[PDB]
Amino acid sequence: PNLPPGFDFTDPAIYAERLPVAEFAELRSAAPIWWNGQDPGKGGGFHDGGFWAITKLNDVKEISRHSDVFSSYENGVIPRFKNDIAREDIEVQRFVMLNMDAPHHTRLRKIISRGFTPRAVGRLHDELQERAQKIAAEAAAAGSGDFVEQVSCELPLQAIAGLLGVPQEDRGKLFHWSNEMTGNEDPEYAHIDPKASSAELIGYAMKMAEEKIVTQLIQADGEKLSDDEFGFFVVMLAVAGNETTRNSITQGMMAFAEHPDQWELYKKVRPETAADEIVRWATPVTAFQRTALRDYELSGVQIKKGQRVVMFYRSANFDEEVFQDPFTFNILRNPNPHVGFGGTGAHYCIGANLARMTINLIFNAVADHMPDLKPISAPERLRSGWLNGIKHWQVDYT
Ligand code: HEM
Ligand SMILES: Clc1ccc(CO[C@H](Cc2c[nH]cn2)c2ccc(Cl)cc2Cl)cc1
């Protein structure tokens, strides 16, 4: 592949500036499964010398289906942390369902599914609709400002808060904790600890369960979450459903600003197909990883026991062999077999429909209250080597 020497698809330095679209496309053409070597002290907390970069949609899907071979437990699924992270701080992330394997995963996913039935998510619809409309109304009123803060941030948080029945009086502190919890190495957030906020939120979660969806989860059925499991559940959601859906909203609106015909069409018909195009295009989670528990031949590459594989959803979502005109934003996209919510398999995003609803509700409200919104200045990107984040985006709502 024509890539610079020692180029690392997980390098936070890249994502601080841009998405490496041209580099991904190069791999898809020249080396769709490619060993991304990492020098010592530069593996983002991993010290195994590198990982297999997975760039093709079907390979991402194959990995995600074969979780009997490709493990989330062994090194967790987050492929990049601060280079100096202690291993202990990686391993502790095995206490969330995301970073478990069968049979422990199966049991927790089965219980936590109580929270995510279409009926449970459907019940949140009206309050989130009301919240979305008021958010949009308040941003329109303010004239201009930070679209991330004023429009993208709060609804995903309210969706988490509503699913859990957090009292309104407690939502402020909950959101504060949640917003310090998804680790990054960005200089704007250098003074934030993850650790303290996580401890403090698990403390609240376990007090909440003590005082008591929360009911369904901690009530015996005789499967129930233990109080610490409920805590681990809440801490997981604070990361899983926060900056993920936020960046779908930010970058979907960015897509609309760049594709004014799509925005015009959206405002008329709010089509059913928009949310999934927004997710495909935003690809909030750039990459998650797995560790091979045995040797596995994947598209002619001999993957070895113990090696990491990094599924770059940002590549797979633009796979030219699958998506017609992948680099066209098409809100009527059909079909749309994207992996923005993961490959289908044991770990496929449990919050996918909760995210779609959040997305439709906010964009309906934006179309309603700020139909002529225009950016004032460039998005500011988050320094993360797995999260595709926009910290700030100054826009003129009128
Ligand atoms: C547009 C927004 C979202 C995106 C792009 C996204 C992305 C993903 C992806 C790629 C995975 C796969 C995990 C893996 O295969 O290793 C996942 C899993 C997960 N997501 Fe989402 N997600 C979003 C919204 C949400 C929301 C709103 C929630 C809940 C409030 C949620 C909860 C979860 C949970 C609990 C898992 C782990 C499932 C398991 O391990 O069994 N997600 N998400
Ligand atoms: Cl007191 C606590 C509570 C919870 C965890 C679980 O550890 C990490 C973050 C993390 C914090 N401190 C060290 N590591 C974590 C991983 C994945 C997700 Cl999706 C969410 C979270 Cl919060 C650890 C300690």
Ligand 1 atom having least distance to the Cα of 159: 30
Query: What one-letter code names the amino acid at 266?
Result: Y
Number of structural domains (the chain) is 1
User: The domain that contains 198 carries what CATH number?
Assistant: 1.10.630.10
Q: Alpha-carbon distance 384 to 246, whole Å?
A: 15
DSSP string, 324-341: SSTTS--TT--S----TT
Task: Tell me which residue of 343, 398, 345, 346 sits closest to 373, measured CA to CA.
Answer: 398
What is the domain range of residue 225? 1-398
Query: What one-letter code names the amino acid at 369?
Result: H
Nearest CA to ligand 1 atom 37: 98
Residue whose entry in the numeric block shows the structure tokens 């291993």: 87
Element (H, E) at 60: helix 57-65
How was this one solved? X-ray
8 Å CB contact between 209 and 189: no
Which own/partner contact pairs does 92-96 have at CB distance under 8 Å and 24+ positions apart? 95/232, 96/232, 96/233, 96/235, 96/236
With a 6 Å cutoff on the Cβ, whether 285 touches ligand 2 is no
Phi, psi of 64 (to 5 degrees): -70, -35
Query: Quick one: residue 338, left, alpha or beta (phi over 0 = left, psi -120 to 50 = alpha)?
Result: beta
End-to-end CA distance of the chain: 46
Q: Alpha-carbon distance 60 to 299, whole Å?
A: 11
Q: Alpha-carbon distance 241 to 260, whole Å?
A: 28
Count Cβ atoms below 10 Å from residue 232 Cβ, excluding itself: 22
Cβ contacts of 302 within 8 Å, gap of 6 or more: 295, 296
Q: Regarding beta strands 390-392 and 287-292, do their DSSP bridges make them parallel or antiparallel, or are they unpaired?
A: unpaired
With a 6 Å cutoff on the Cβ, whether 370 touches ligand 2 is no
Whether the upstream peptide bond of residue 335 has omega within 30° of 0, thus cis, is yes
Whether the upstream peptide bond of residue 40 has omega within 30° of 0, thus cis, is no
Q: Alpha-carbon distance 72 to 350, whole Å?
A: 16
8 Å CB contact between 235 and 94: no
Q: Alpha-carbon distance 324 to 308, whole Å?
A: 30
Beta bridge partners, 297, equal: 302
Q: Which of 92, 178, 227 to mutate to test the pocket of ligand 2 (most atoms within 8 A of CB)?
A: 92
Task: Tell me which residue of 256, 197, 205 sits closest to 229, measured CA to CA.
Answer: 205
Q: Alpha-carbon distance 391 to 377, whole Å?
A: 13
Q: Alpha-carbon distance 365 to 151, whole Å?
A: 10
Count Cβ atoms below 10 Å from residue 126 Cβ, excluding itself: 9
Cβ contacts of 190 within 8 Å, gap of 6 or more: none
Cα 373 to Cα 68, 140, 147, distances in angstroms = 47, 9, 10
Half-sphere exposure of 75 (CA within 13 A, CB side): 25
Query: What one-letter code names the amino acid at 4?
Result: P
Q: Which of 78, 124, 229, 244 to mutate to test the pocket of ligand 1 (most atoms within 8 A of CB)?
A: 244
The structure tokens listed for 174 are 């909950």
Q: Alpha-carbon distance 205 to 95, whole Å?
A: 15
The structure tokens listed for 100 are 């478990």
Nearest CA to ligand 1 atom 27: 241
DSSP string, 196-254: HHHHHHHHHHHHHHHH--HHHHHS-------HHHHHHHHHHHHHHTSHHHHHHHHHHHH
Q: Alpha-carbon distance 283 to 290, whole Å?
A: 18
Phi, psi of 308 (to 5 degrees): -85, 145
Count Cβ atoms below 10 Å from residue 83 Cβ, excluding itself: 15
Q: Regarding beta strands 50-54 and 308-312, do their DSSP bridges make them parallel or antiparallel, or are they unpaired?
A: parallel
Breaks (C-N over 2.5 A) in the chain follow: 212, 221
Q: Three-state SS for 290?
A: strand
Strand order in the sheet with 287-292: 33-37, 50-54, 308-312, 287-292, 70-71
Q: Which residues of 288-310 are buried (b: 16+ CB within 10 A; e: fewer)?
A: bbbbbbeebebeebebeeebbbb
